[PDB]
Design a protein around this motif. Structure first.
Motif, PDB file in Angstrom:
ATOM      1  N   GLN A   1      -5.892   1.019  -2.349  1.00  0.00           N
ATOM      2  CA  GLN A   1      -7.295   1.151  -4.257  1.00  0.00           C
ATOM      3  C   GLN A   1      -6.008   2.257  -5.136  1.00  0.00           C
ATOM      4  O   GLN A   1      -6.113   1.981  -5.658  1.00  0.00           O
ATOM      5  CB  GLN A   1      -8.409   0.911  -4.079  1.00  0.00           C
ATOM      6  N   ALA A   2      -5.786   3.072  -4.426  1.00  0.00           N
ATOM      7  CA  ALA A   2      -5.213   4.090  -5.414  1.00  0.00           C
ATOM      8  C   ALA A   2      -3.955   3.078  -5.893  1.00  0.00           C
ATOM      9  O   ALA A   2      -3.400   3.623  -7.800  1.00  0.00           O
ATOM     10  CB  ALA A   2      -4.254   4.571  -4.188  1.00  0.00           C
TER      11      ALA A   2
ATOM     12  N   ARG B   1      -7.269  -7.439   1.782  1.00  0.00           N
ATOM     13  CA  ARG B   1      -7.296  -6.474   3.094  1.00  0.00           C
ATOM     14  C   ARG B   1      -6.620  -8.083   4.383  1.00  0.00           C
ATOM     15  O   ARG B   1      -7.180  -9.040   3.466  1.00  0.00           O
ATOM     16  CB  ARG B   1      -8.574  -6.312   3.720  1.00  0.00           C
TER      17      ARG B   1
ATOM     18  N   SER C   1       0.920  -1.298  -0.072  1.00  0.00           N
ATOM     19  CA  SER C   1      -0.392  -0.156  -0.022  1.00  0.00           C
ATOM     20  C   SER C   1       1.110   1.317   0.243  1.00  0.00           C
ATOM     21  O   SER C   1       0.056   1.809  -0.204  1.00  0.00           O
ATOM     22  CB  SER C   1      -0.889   0.121   1.107  1.00  0.00           C
ATOM     23  N   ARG C   2       2.493   1.278   0.711  1.00  0.00           N
ATOM     24  CA  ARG C   2       2.914   2.036   0.478  1.00  0.00           C
ATOM     25  C   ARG C   2       4.755   1.662   0.138  1.00  0.00           C
ATOM     26  O   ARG C   2       4.969   0.936   0.209  1.00  0.00           O
ATOM     27  CB  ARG C   2       2.710   2.845   2.019  1.00  0.00           C
TER      28      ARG C   2
ATOM     29  N   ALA D   1      -5.229   0.752   5.824  1.00  0.00           N
ATOM     30  CA  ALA D   1      -5.114   1.518   4.411  1.00  0.00           C
ATOM     31  C   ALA D   1      -5.997   0.628   3.164  1.00  0.00           C
ATOM     32  O   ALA D   1      -4.850   0.613   2.394  1.00  0.00           O
ATOM     33  CB  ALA D   1      -3.182   2.089   4.206  1.00  0.00           C
ATOM     34  N   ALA D   2      -6.900   0.560   3.176  1.00  0.00           N
ATOM     35  CA  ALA D   2      -7.697   0.512   1.890  1.00  0.00           C
ATOM     36  C   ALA D   2      -7.731   1.501   0.680  1.00  0.00           C
ATOM     37  O   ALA D   2      -7.619   0.993  -0.457  1.00  0.00           O
ATOM     38  CB  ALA D   2      -9.590  -0.211   2.294  1.00  0.00           C
ATOM     39  N   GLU D   3      -7.998   2.879   0.876  1.00  0.00           N
ATOM     40  CA  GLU D   3      -7.856   3.969   0.155  1.00  0.00           C
ATOM     41  C   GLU D   3      -6.143   3.534  -0.573  1.00  0.00           C
ATOM     42  O   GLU D   3      -6.570   3.784  -1.833  1.00  0.00           O
ATOM     43  CB  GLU D   3      -8.312   5.158   0.773  1.00  0.00           C
ATOM     44  N   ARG D   4      -5.498   3.885  -0.123  1.00  0.00           N
ATOM     45  CA  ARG D   4      -3.941   3.852  -0.227  1.00  0.00           C
ATOM     46  C   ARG D   4      -3.747   2.383  -1.203  1.00  0.00           C
ATOM     47  O   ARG D   4      -3.476   2.962  -2.443  1.00  0.00           O
ATOM     48  CB  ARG D   4      -2.912   4.078   0.962  1.00  0.00           C
TER      49      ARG D   4
ATOM     50  N   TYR E   1      -2.801  -5.431   2.628  1.00  0.00           N
ATOM     51  CA  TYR E   1      -3.348  -3.971   3.104  1.00  0.00           C
ATOM     52  C   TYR E   1      -4.199  -4.317   4.913  1.00  0.00           C
ATOM     53  O   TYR E   1      -4.278  -4.916   4.731  1.00  0.00           O
ATOM     54  CB  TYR E   1      -3.841  -3.438   2.887  1.00  0.00           C
TER      55      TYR E   1
ATOM     56  N   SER F   1      -5.228   1.413  -8.893  1.00  0.00           N
ATOM     57  CA  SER F   1      -5.644   2.397 -10.209  1.00  0.00           C
ATOM     58  C   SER F   1      -4.330   2.726 -10.848  1.00  0.00           C
ATOM     59  O   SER F   1      -4.091   2.283 -11.899  1.00  0.00           O
ATOM     60  CB  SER F   1      -5.269   3.601  -9.528  1.00  0.00           C
TER      61      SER F   1
END
Lengths: 252, 252, 252, 252
Positions: free
Chosen positions: C51-52, C68, C21-22, C46-49, C43, C55
């Protein structure tokens, strides 16, 4: 008790110590003689210093001789060894402790500088080892003095010295395989900053070294001599091919 | 002489030795008591074996106590340490020597197996260290028993055990930095094949291990105890953060 | 040409990347997807991170899914792996890149702190490896992200983190023996100071780290991803059981 | 894509490769030329073999020259380097790959044997490095070919060869410090058993080596060339002072 003291003792062993006139080498030659070894120590030109180490060893009750042998000259080393054997009866312990320090910017280092560092730091230990090795038997000991710079080089300027000591560690592993089946152990001790002429506990540049040390101060030649003396005796029998760093934690 | 024997001596020091009931741990607890240390040794369920080690130490003139402390239970370890301190006066030397052996095909190794190997091999030494560390002062010693498998893994089947010992070496370097400014040294000794219950000098499978050894035979628990005893005393003062392999050259 | 580009390519391989995620993990998941791998990245919250990152990988033409899976929960990891296999077709590459940083004075470190660092830094990689290992075949890759602190610990305060990474290197050697005969390589990459959230190139405390670096600056996550991507592909086939340090020379 | 392929590319770089006439050196000179480097390769007396490597590189679309330079002669190496610079425009990549094998019982090894192994294995790389180093700039690369015997010596008979390679690793760390502030990386790659003239995948004695290998077979010169090519290009920028072992797991 006395059995464990038999554990510590080198009585009846003959040691040959290169660089025995000063610093670490002199402290080793003295500690080995304190535990009972008869000690031949070599020097290149510091005749008086080497004789005074022999006198200190004699005064404390031991036996020692100083022999002149330029480490640049393979024949001189081999003669010194033959002499030791004839005068002291055999050869049971070899300690290589005649390294020289070298430091310089790479742009000022020549091929002759490499040749000079290696002749004394790397080639002179191999010469002594290959010649001592006919004389050593079951129970024999080879101990080389390396440097913690063999494993970790924190500064520019010291590639030759660091490399010469890393070479000795690699030579040590291979010699442990060669000499093992004969009952001889071959090890290398890597001192860190040790209060000597080569490396005075007073800066300049002591501080950069001192900062690294986990226990906060330079060690002493006696610290290195005690590990060498332990390896040299019966309690070192199951240690061989090993690198042992004694550096106050600088390398942690 | 007597000055160098002051060099060897542990008189007045209190030692805490985990795994003191057998093999390497028992040999260490005895050698430490021979040099003058008062020794608390721990055991998980082998009550009789631990008492007989205490009797041997008493018969040779030393002082020792056996304390029951399951290495899986952090509270039990910390209580054992508090007890040692109260009964013997303080705590100057910690030796972690309670590892368990583990070997299995990867396809038969479970997450519970990892958890179990680590609880005793890796976590129990950290617990003892963190608790002993309030009591240790200038001159204190932490010595952990690792394995030469921490540096070199020649076989399948031993990833957990090897990893638990490699973790201890990494913990050792970091703890040497933590405890250095207080005058405490922290080292790890890596034994190779040592004739024990865990590892009998008689095969099956001894031969694969024996073949590796440069000097040709398994060592003995006494070999490991002599290096531990040397590190534990005044002559170990400039060694810290170090890994010392005592394995007959298996790792060369 | 195109033959050497076949040399670089991961088309048709499925990768599972923990900590995707990071920082380093996200850079690896992206580089692996750039070379053709379909990537599952995990992850904890940090679900949004996550997904990005998916993307970004989709926008550049690749395939990826975010799953997750709390690294503290062995069942969650094993489910994530089963899901990856079902959704993406198989599993060819595992990258363990979900470490957490930990630093604290020893006197403030508890047994619960040890337990917590190890659950995520050391135990969660073993869980993923043992579960991925049923699915990997000839040509499979396991790569773990360690730290240069696994080999060299210059500071107090970091014993747990350093130890967790040293444990992974020892686990790596033993797993290379286990998985070798099946054609799977198992390696560990040790990043030094890498400009991330965990380790920002802006001090405080950046300077102490920066001073060590031979080439003068922090590296970037992309540096680590390029070594991982090289190991993950056909050109890594003769590298296994290896530690590869990518740290700008901090450890020299 | 094309951006990552810019990631792989050596177009516009000049490489100097010692031992480029055969085995690992020839595979490196070819892989470097495949990625766009113009390559000068040296040879001692195998003129025809070196010319045929140049022809292969020309046929695949690259640029290369063969220069005669006896590694025993420092002046010959420095002239070869000056020639490379004049003919090809500058010097961006140095690869030291001209080692010779040596094996013999210790009792049959002379001081002249040491001198001979070191002149070519250890001294000739330092000569090339010290001379290439005036020409290299920001982005420069020094890569030395070592051996996995630099870290682990499993057999008697190979002390000189092992030591010469361990020396190179120690020289590498110190040179990484020297050359780092100029933006030059300095690394050493340690190949294990690689199917060559020096080391044929057919025994005698292949089996002892083959048994060690975790993934079950000798590697190929191309494996070593791919790691060298990766280090030589932009993706190697944060790797320096490093030892990278590529040995199929022999050293695990």
């Amino acid at each position: 008790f006395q059995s464990m003291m038999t554990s510590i003792s080198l009585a009846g062993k003959t040691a040959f110590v290169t660089g025995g006139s000063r610093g670490i080498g002199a402290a080793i030659a003295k500690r080995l003689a304190l535990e009972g070894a008869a000690v031949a120590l070599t020097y290149v030109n510091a005749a008086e210093r080497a004789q005074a180490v022999v006198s200190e060893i004699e005064q404390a009750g031991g036996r020692a001789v100083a022999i002149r042998a330029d480490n640049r000259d393979a024949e001189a080393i081999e003669q010194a060894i033959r002499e030791t054997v004839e005068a002291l009866g055999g050869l049971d312990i070899l300690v290589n402790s005649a390294g020289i320090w070298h430091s310089a910017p790479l742009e000022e280092t020549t091929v002759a500088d490499f040749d000079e560092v290696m002749a004394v730091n790397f080639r002179a230990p191999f010469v002594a080892i290959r010649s001592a090795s006919r004389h050593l038997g079951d129970g024999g000991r080879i101990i080389t003095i390396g440097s913690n710079l063999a494993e970790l080089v924190p500064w520019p300027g010291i590639s030759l010295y660091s490399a010469s000591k890393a070479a000795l560690a690699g030579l040590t592993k291979g010699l442990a395989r060669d000499l093992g089946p004969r009952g001889i152990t071959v090890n290398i001790v890597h001192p860190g900053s040790t209060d000597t002429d080569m490396n005075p506990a007073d800066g300049d540049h002591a501080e950069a070294q001192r900062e690294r040390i986990a226990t906060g101060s330079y060690g002493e030649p006696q610290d290195i001599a005690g590990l060498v003396a332990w390896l040299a005796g019966p309690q070192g029998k199951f240690v061989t091919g090993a690198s042992l760093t004694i550096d106050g934690g600088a390398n942690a």
